[PDB]
Amino acid sequence: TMIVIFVHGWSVTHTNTYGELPQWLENQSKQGKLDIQVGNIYLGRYISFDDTVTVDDIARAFDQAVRDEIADKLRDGQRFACITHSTGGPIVRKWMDLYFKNNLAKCPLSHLIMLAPANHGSALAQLGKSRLGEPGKCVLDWLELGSDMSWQLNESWLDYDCTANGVYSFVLTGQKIDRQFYDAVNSYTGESGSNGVVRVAATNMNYSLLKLHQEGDNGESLVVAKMTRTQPMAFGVLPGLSHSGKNIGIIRSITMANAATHPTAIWILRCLQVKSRDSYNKLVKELDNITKETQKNEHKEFVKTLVFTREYITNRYSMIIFRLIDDRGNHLIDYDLYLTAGPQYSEQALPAGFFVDRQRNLNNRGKLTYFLDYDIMEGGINTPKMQGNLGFRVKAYPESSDQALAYYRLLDFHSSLADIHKILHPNETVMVEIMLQRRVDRTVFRISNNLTPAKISGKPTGKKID
Amino acid sequence: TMIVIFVHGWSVTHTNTYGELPQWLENQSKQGKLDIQVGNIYLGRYISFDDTVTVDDIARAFDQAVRDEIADKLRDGQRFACITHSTGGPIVRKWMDLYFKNNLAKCPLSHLIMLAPANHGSALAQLGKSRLGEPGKCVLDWLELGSDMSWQLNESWLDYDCTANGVYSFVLTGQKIDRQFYDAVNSYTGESGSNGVVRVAATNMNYSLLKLHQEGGESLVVAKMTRTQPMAFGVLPGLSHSGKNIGIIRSITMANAATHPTAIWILRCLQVKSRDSYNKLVKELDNITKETQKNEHKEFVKTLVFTREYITNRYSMIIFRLIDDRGNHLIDYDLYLTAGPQYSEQALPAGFFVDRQRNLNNRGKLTYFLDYDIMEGGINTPKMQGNLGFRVKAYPESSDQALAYYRLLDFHSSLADIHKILHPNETVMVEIMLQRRVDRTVFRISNNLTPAKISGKPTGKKID
Amino acid sequence: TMIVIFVHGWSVTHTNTYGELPQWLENQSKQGKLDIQVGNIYLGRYISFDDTVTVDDIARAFDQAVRDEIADKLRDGQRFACITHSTGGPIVRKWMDLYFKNNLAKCPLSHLIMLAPANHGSALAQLGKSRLGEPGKCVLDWLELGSDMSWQLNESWLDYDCTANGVYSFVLTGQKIDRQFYDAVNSYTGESGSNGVVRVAATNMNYSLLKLHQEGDNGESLVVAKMTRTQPMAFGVLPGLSHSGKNIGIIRSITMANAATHPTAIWILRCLQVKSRDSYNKLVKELDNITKETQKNEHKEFVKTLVFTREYITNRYSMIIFRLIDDRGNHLIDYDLYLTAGPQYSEQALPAGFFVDRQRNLNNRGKLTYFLDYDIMEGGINTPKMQGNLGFRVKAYPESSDQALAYYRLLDFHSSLADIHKILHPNETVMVEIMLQRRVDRTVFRISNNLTPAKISGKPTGKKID
Amino acid sequence: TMIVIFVHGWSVTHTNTYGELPQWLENQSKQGKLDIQVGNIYLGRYISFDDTVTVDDIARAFDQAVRDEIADKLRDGQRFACITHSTGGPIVRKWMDLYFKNNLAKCPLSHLIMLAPANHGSALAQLGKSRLGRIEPGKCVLDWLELGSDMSWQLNESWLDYDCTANGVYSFVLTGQKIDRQFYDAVNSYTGESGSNGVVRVAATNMNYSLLKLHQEGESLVVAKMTRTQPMAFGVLPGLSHSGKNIGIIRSITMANAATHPTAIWILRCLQVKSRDSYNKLVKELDNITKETQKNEHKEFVKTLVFTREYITNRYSMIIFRLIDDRGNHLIDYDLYLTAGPQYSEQALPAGFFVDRQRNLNNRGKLTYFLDYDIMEGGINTPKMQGNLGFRVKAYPESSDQALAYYRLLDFHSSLADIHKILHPNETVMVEIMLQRRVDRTVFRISNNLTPAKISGKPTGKKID
Ligand SMILES: NC(=S)c1ccc[n+]([C@@H]2O[C@H](COP(=O)([O-])OP(=O)(O)OC[C@H]3O[C@@H](n4cnc5c(N)ncnc54)[C@H](O)[C@@H]3O)[C@@H](O)[C@H]2O)c1
Ligand SMILES: NC(=S)c1ccc[n+]([C@@H]2O[C@H](COP(=O)([O-])OP(=O)(O)OC[C@H]3O[C@@H](n4cnc5c(N)ncnc54)[C@H](O)[C@@H]3O)[C@@H](O)[C@H]2O)c1
Ligand SMILES: NC(=S)c1ccc[n+]([C@@H]2O[C@H](COP(=O)([O-])OP(=O)(O)OC[C@H]3O[C@@H](n4cnc5c(N)ncnc54)[C@H](O)[C@@H]3O)[C@@H](O)[C@H]2O)c1
Ligand SMILES: NC(=S)c1ccc[n+]([C@@H]2O[C@H](COP(=O)([O-])OP(=O)(O)OC[C@H]3O[C@@H](n4cnc5c(N)ncnc54)[C@H](O)[C@@H]3O)[C@@H](O)[C@H]2O)c1
């Protein structure tokens, strides 16, 4: 039999954040659609408004909360399904990483259903505690785009295979703005490609990590590339749902009256009924078809008022998180990073409208997140004259011996959107780690058996050390 | 045969920084006291005035400078002695660590003679580029007391056995201030227990790392102390860091070298060829240290206007590193020394303190500089019972304050027995790991499906 | 007779910055078009790349340079015209302020011809020294949008009447981007409404200062408004001209061969020929006609390449510099500032596309600069449904007694874009000083003749002090 | 008739901070010692633990508090005496400055009795909010109390022009210099600083101070101008710390001990002052008590079961330096030297002259030195040292070759042997040094050679006017 545990998001102070979905699941079980005994549905509550509490702290506390309440039930063979919202996803994923990484088959969790999870962060976190209010400062450090902590967790997750270990994981999210909750001085709260809080691409656990490492001898720079990708995970963009709120909040808006027709309740029930690789994979495809339908139907939105009418265009988007490092363990903080396109990989040739947002992490200036319009990029680049080309160029500083005796050579990376080995996918994040060679001029240290003392020159030799 | 390589200190722009010692060593070899062929004495020069250059960079560049110039001689069997001054010591130790840590026996270096090395940092580094000029910011990051980089290098060196691998390493330093070069606005330039730039205790490669890990509703402490292998250590008389007057290497001339302590003892160090020869020199230099520090204990300087008395005892340096068991460096804490039968923070001997500095890049790094002779004399008395200890209060300190918090740590020790943590002329590294306590309220689950406000009230019980 | 002194801009290291215009003016005098003796055209050179040198320093040093070189000529009755570029404008205006503020009739300057002057700052200055390279840090503090120093100078200049004192002042600028010099990672270098460095609106010496002062006891918050405007100054937006460069730089591109047909050279000669109020006002109107013609003709720009075609739309823009203070001498650093529109003055009703940029000064967080599309604002607000309404709402924090015992009441200002008393004009900056009342609850200090000692409560009374 | 208003210090949360002194005064009045009607003794309470509230806010609120409670009594001729503790002194002085500066005769206050007031700041304020509550306080008040604060400078510069006595306002400062050694914070040694009561330095309580202006002209020359406050009664009472029921200057007063308590005794005297002649006699009496107290407390021996401590307390001076130039800048990059001896060397100060230095965190041109006056005087006023004492200021950049805008060194030569000295035991001296900002002529040149050329930054060696 199944236990269900609800886990909420950040800045929550009341378990009504779960709407009435717990009570509904209870009733569905009584109707034979789920095998949940009365008393096996649990509401989680964790503290998100304490500046001292870290995500590590919360994930450790969940392990304790589980043992304190259902240790007997787990010993008797029961496994639980977690239904998470917002930060709840990352926290449960961290708990899995802390206690079961190399051993998912013994994890007492059977289903992970993440609702609008901030798996690759929220652009709002950087706005900080004062403006955002409420949220705890340490959890905002995790949620900040480009966070070193989310990078570490998500790099660890590249190696996971939940499905093969009998753990069925799902991401469901929406991309509707509840336009009554638009903060006019913080336009992230209405950002296209988001639900007001998390970007669709930042919810998706289908992502890649691309490592580009600079090589070279005496002469010119070369680039070795390696891409690794997470295992497939169910991913669905459901229609008409925002992050929060009783109107169209992805979970907040569920009631006993509307649940039967509520996309979230409908698909959560399906997810929980998965018991096999075959059933999982059918739901993967079903949710992908729903995604395609949702995003076509919501592409254009017309909002009518007594005074004005607005048109809103919602395409599909990609998020790049760049990590700039060198081969001596430094994060690079002084650099220019270019996208390039066209037959000559020009920084001036990107399709007009490619850009939505950029943000640089406040704790690590080597972490830079770009948010791009995938459909505008693909349409403009995959033409005869543009040849499908897409690339990066990174210029780190100092750039030559004449400026400093330690310096970096420019890196160029040439790719394509015209084949299946591409680095951008709609509704996905890609993590890009660029490692430059730290070049040190031989003048940094010379020895000479001329014993006549002399002034020490800083003039470069023009030849780097090994 | 022997090759010699000179390696200078920070902010140097001219190889006259070496005085005339290279030419003197060349003459000593012709007289038969050394086996150095003409042309096998090398002057090292590196860039310490470039803000982009790191100690990692310089040590890597040393490897290339060596290969570029004497690769042939090293294949032909020759090994080299490095004579370093100031940061040159750490730099050569970093090179050894990058290229030979697990294989010192293959290291082409046979002798490491460090003159006034900033092995555990310089208090002046924090004063920073502008005030100190000139020096390069990244090297100052390394030299800053409590630096994460020097800690990492010196923690690595706990495992070295240079002598066992045929590498004979020596530290020589002085503790005389050149009083013509006192910066009245920056009194570190005349600090007792230093030569104006480096503290005697900060040069010594004889040091311990003491780990104190909190365990446990009752707080306990597990202590573990590890110590470097013995290295030759000599405090030479009448020598300051730099300058032609009494600079430890700068003042050496062809005329005075035969009477100059640095030249005399460097020649002895170079002649060491065996464990037995090495150990003889360890003892001799220790005797010279004891003699120097007694003779220089009281210094009288009289001018036409006034007469100053300067007292110089012997000193100990503590570098504290405060962390927790979840990978955090701790930044909000109070650290107490304690003494007396009750381990009171109010009972330290009067005059025990010289200095404290907190690292600007890592606030979990705190360096105390103490007068060992005042401490020992006040603590090892009948009424004080020899007690010395630490108390650390990290914040937040309780559930009601925050749902993640720390319990006080108390460590109780003694200066009365051989297992003591403080030694004269030594730095001690103290890593204290507290347990991060998280109250169970941080996460609860309930099968009461009736929604309700979430309370932050502590349970008073911590999670595993 | 006339002396001419050229004065360059920031980051300049070579007097070829002036093009060949000095040599050309020399020949126009020899042909009887100007009254400039041989040897009475001077090239100014000042140091813009020293981090210790201030705008105050440079204006003081200009005075010394003039006395060192032409004191005798000035004693004999000669006066000089300054032709300035970029920062040179602000610098000569500071010199006028330091030495002749209350006394412009004694000023030895007869004409001030400012070419693309950064009179209200440059958005690029905040990007700082490293990224911009070169430029001196203290001059960048002046040029920064919202700078306290430029505010002080320009508030002083509200009281000037150059024309009445026989000083003929002119601003000429362009709004063409030299698209060869677009920095892809810093899009200010191609900002619509700018020449790549200075926004048209930031060059204009026709501007207003609007003071909004909050009044009211307990009960109702009310606002007293006072607007002051500079005297009219000649202002022209010339066609086809960018900030810099030999291609189309407003002064750099002038050669002996093209000068006769070069807009800058042609209109400089007209300005130098002004000798009276009547000729000045004639030129004011002629240049306004040129501005209207330029901005219609350049409204749409099509750039064709072998690979793609770009369309660029340039309207007319307004810049607002907000200064937030209170009645006790504090700059406010914690506030939300809203534009409002529609019949209900809603922050949600602004015309779509109204916004170009916002910047907050790094030295004074009470200084906030918005850059707006005037033509989109006007077209959307001046409709039957929108009634012409435009307003401000300022929410400063803390906002109530319950949050802090010293707090601020919200301020609302209601205006119109349909009257001649409007606060926005195309191609103009408006300075908006908002002064809020600092409310202090009576609990901050009480006295009682009950001598029984008791704990001190911080509970607000709900009544403020006088 | 007299009204008495009690005003407390910072971080206070309970009106027992006043000890039993208000009740004792009431009892004293019921016996004829004072003419205070029953009901005319008021306890003041203000908020010091709110980060948004400033000293300006508190002084404004004091005015409202007074009008709200005793407006009728003041309209009918009554005037009040303020008995203040710690920050209460500066607060009441700010209220006087806001509402009565050039009109003290109309001020309803008749007596200002300041107990251990932080008139020139507290060294502890820089330690900030988190650290101080562990030894709570509102950040904006700490900005006022910080040594070298721009706000205290402004109030105390304004007070140079006051003459309370001439306007019928009788002002007094009483303080102590005893450490309550049970409340020593081992990691923050300011809490036991010699020359202080654990919170405020005696020299920082004193309203007898000077402002010395040194303006550079020009070789460099220096014009000096010293202005001094009017005499104010100043007494250092024996055996009294800042706070605590043990020996706290006001906290330790009880009905039982008040008759023998130095604070109650001398407060009563101060309140009874009704004339210039009575005031001046009290000034001299209090100065005698100061000399006695500081002689009797010069040496303190503290004995325990484990050890014995000797503590030496001399008399101290505090210098607050303010470095500016003639163009409105505060200087942030400089070296400041004291100098002594026949050649005004920075190496010739008497050994032990120094206690403390602190630089303001909001204005790096504000530097506070705390010096041992008795050590300074004894070492400088000798035949070989000639009584010399001076300042040298080296601001940066210091030459054309370093920067085209730069400063020339300033040297000021003075003496501790004459009556016009700048240092006084138990006093603060504010020193404003204004340097000439020198700008090399290369910063702007004009030339009628129309051949374009590179712009040289080489300095000319001649400055602009
Ligand atoms: N603020 C939102 S929702 C937003 C939207 C899109 C991109 N970004 C990026 O996210 C990062 C941080 O955004 P940001 O801090 O808003 O940056 P931004 O550069 O827009 O603003 C800088 C500062 O000015 C403040 N400010 C701006 N406008 C107002 C206003 N009307 N009233 C009051 N204060 C104002 C703002 O709160 C912040 O402290 C930057 O990289 C932005 O480019 C932010
Ligand atoms: N400066 C030296 S040599 C010194 C000596 C002993 C201990 N320490 C410790 O080292 C750390 C840094 O020293 P610090 O920055 O000098 O600290 P300190 O607190 O003494 O000085 C604070 C600031 O004021 C400046 N300042 C102080 N006196 C003067 C003066 N006479 N002229 C100009 N500026 C002045 C000083 O340069 C610094 O920027 C602190 O932890 C000190 O306690 C420093
Ligand atoms: N930078 C230009 S030209 C620009 C354009 C429009 C508005 N603004 C506003 O001006 C202010 C300062 O702009 P900003 O500092 O660029 O803020 P922004 O929020 O765009 O960038 C934050 C930081 O990220 C850095 N960064 C962003 N993208 C890249 C990249 N591709 N390569 C390297 N570093 C990158 C950038 O240099 C800065 O240090 C903010 O208020 C912006 O919203 C700037
Ligand atoms: N702290 C006191 S009471 C004190 C005494 C005399 C002079 N001063 C001057 O006042 C200014 C500020 O003093 P400061 O912040 O103490 O400067 P200091 O330079 O002594 O300390 C630097 C930093 O290290 C911290 N620190 C030092 N010792 C310990 C310890 N045992 N446990 C935990 N943390 C420690 C201290 O809190 C501070 O954040 C400086 O100019 C000092 O020289 C302070």
Which sequence spans correspond to the domains of chain C?
2-201+231-299, 317-443
Q: Which residue has the tokens 């992970």?
A: A112
The four Cα atoms D369, D372, D377, D383 give a dihedral, to 10 degrees, of -90
Domain C2-201+231-299 matches domain C317-443 at the CATH topology level: no
Resolution to one decimal, Å: 1.8
Q: Which atom of ligand 1 is nearest to the CA of A357?
A: 7
B346 touches chain D (CB under 8 A): yes
Rounded Cα–Cα distance for residues D394 and D408 (Å): 7
With b for 16 or more beta-carbon neighbours within 10 A and e for fewer, the C287-300 pattern comes to: beebbeebbeebee
Closest CA to D359 of D388, D381, D383, D330: D330
Q: How far apart are CA D389 and CA D350, in angstroms?
A: 11
Q: Which residue is closest to D339 within chain B, CA to CA?
A: B184
**Is B315-441 CATH 2.60.40?**
yes
* Nearest residue of D to residue B356, measured between CA atoms: D187
Residues of the binding site of C: 131, 179, 182, 184, 186-188, 336-337, 339, 347, 350, 353, 358, 360, 370
- C317-443 CATH, one of 1.20.120, 2.60.120, 3.30.70, 2.60.40: 2.60.40
Burial class (CB in 10 A: 0-12, 13-18, 19+), A296: exposed
C-alpha gyration radius of chain D = 25
Q: Tokens 């929108």 sit at which residue?
A: C386
Region D316-442: CATH code: 2.60.40
Fold of B2-204+230-301: Rossmann fold (3.40.50)
B and A adjacent (3 or more CB pairs under 8 angstroms) = yes
Residues of D annotated in the binding site for NAD(+), as ranges?
131, 181, 184, 186, 188-190, 335-336, 338, 346, 349, 352, 357, 359, 369
Distance CA C41, CA C62 (A): 16
Number of helices and strands in chain D (H, E): 10, 20
Cβ count within 10 A of residue C258 = 13
Residue whose Cα lies nearest atom 15 of ligand 4: it is: D127
Q: Which residues of C touch D13 (CB under 8 A)?
A: 455-456
Report yes or no: B374 and B315 within 8 Å, Cβ to Cβ.
no
Cα gap A451→B288, rounded to integer Å: 31
Which residues 6+ apart lie within 8 Å of B311 measured at CB? B192, B297, B298, B299
Distances in whole angstroms, Cα of residue B297 to Cα of each of B226, B300, B311, B347, B350: 31, 10, 6, 26, 19
| Helix count and strand count (H, E) for chain A | 10, 20
CA distances from A170 to A43, B84, C298, D195 (A): 19, 62, 53, 70
Q: Give dist(CA B126, CA B122) in Å, integer.
A: 8
Ligand 2 within 6 A of B185 CB? Answer: yes
What is the helix, strand, coil percentage profile of chain A, to 5?
A: 30, 30, 40
d(CA C192, CA D181) in angstroms, rounded, equals 69
Q: CA nearest A207: which of A187, A224, A230?
A: A230
Task: For residue B424, report the distance from its CA to the centre of ligand 4, in Å.
Answer: 25
Cα separation, C67 vs A81, in Å, equals: 85
Residues 6+ apart with CB under 8 A from B444: A44, A45, A46, A65, A68
- C188 Cβ closer than 6 Å to some ligand 3 atom: yes
Q: Are B58 and B91 in contact (CB under 8 A)?
A: yes
Rounded Cα distance between B95 and B44, Å, is 14
Residue ranges of D 196-235 with Cβ closer than 8 A to chain C: none
What CATH class does A2-206+231-304 carry?
A: alpha beta
The finding on whether A337 has its CB within 6 A of some atom of ligand 3 is yes
Which residues of A does the annotation place in the binding site for NAD(+)?
131, 179, 182, 184, 186-188, 336-337, 339, 347, 350, 353, 358, 360, 370
Tell me if B211 sits within 8 A of B204, measured CB to CB.
no
- This entry's atomic model was obtained through X-ray
- Ligand 3 midpoint to CA A392 (Å): 18
Ligand 2 binding pocket mutation candidate from D354, D359, D391, D410 (most atoms within 8 A of CB): D359
Of B436, B443, B453, the CB nearest to A46: B443
DSSP annotation of A332: P
Q: Is A134 an interface residue toward C (CB < 8 Å)? A: no
Distance CA A208, CA A158 (A): 8
- Residue pair C314/C298 in contact by the 8 Å Cβ criterion: yes
Burial zone of B113 (CB within 10 Å; 0-12 exposed, 13-18 middle, 19+ buried):
buried
**Ligand 3: does its nearest atom lie under 6 Å from the Cβ of C357?**
yes
Strand D405-406 versus strand D428-435 pairing type: unpaired
- Mutate-to-test residue for ligand 1 from A359, A360, A361, A363, highest number of ligand atoms within 8 A of CB: A359
Residues forming a β-bridge with D14: C455
Rounded to whole angstroms, how far apart are CA atoms C432 and C223? 13
Give the C-alpha separation, D267 to B146, whole Å: 52
Q: Which residue has the tokens 């060949």?
A: C20
Residue with tokens 């014993």: A451
Q: Tell me how far CA of residue A336 lies from CA of A330, A366, B222, D87, D159, in angstroms.
A: 16, 11, 49, 52, 56
Secondary structure element (H or E) that encloses residue D383, with its range:
none
Exposure string for B375-403, b = 16+ CB within 10 A, e = fewer:
bbbbbbeeebbbbbbbbbbbbbbebeebb
Instruction: Tell me if B265 sits within 8 A of B285, measured CB to CB.
Output: yes
Say how many C-beta atoms besides its own lie within 10 A of residue B329's C-beta: 13
Q: Please, which residues have CB within 8 angstroms of residue C197's CB and are 6 or more apart in sequence?
A: C86, C116, C118, C122, C124, C189, C243, C244
| Amino acid found at A413 | F
**D397 preceded by cis ω (within 30°)?**
yes
- Inter-axis angle of helices D88-100 and D150-159, nearest 10: 60
Half-sphere exposure of D149 (CA within 13 A, CB side): 25
At the top level of CATH, which class does the domain D2-198+230-303 belong to? alpha beta
Chain C partners within 8 Å of A310 (Cβ): 352
Tokens 């399904």 -> residue: A81
- Contacts (Cβ under 8 Å, ≥6 apart) of A224: A212, A213, A215
Looking at all shown ligands, the one closest to residue C182's CA atom is: 3
> Contact, B427 vs B317, CB < 8 A?
yes
Q: What are phi and psi of A66, to 5 degrees?
A: -65, -50
Q: What contacts A220, CB < 8 A, 6 or more positions away?
A: none
Q: Interior CA angle at D155 toward D153 and D157, to 5°?
A: 65
Q: What are phi and psi of D213, to 5 degrees?
A: -100, 130
- CATH level 3 topology of C2-201+231-299: Rossmann fold (3.40.50)
CA of B218 to the centre of ligand 1 (A): 49
**Given an 8 Å threshold on Cβ–Cβ distance, is A342 in contact with C385?**
no
In terms of Cα–Cα distance, which of B8, B214, B246, B222 is closest to B115? B8
Q: Does residue B344 line the site of ligand 2, with CB under 6 A?
A: no
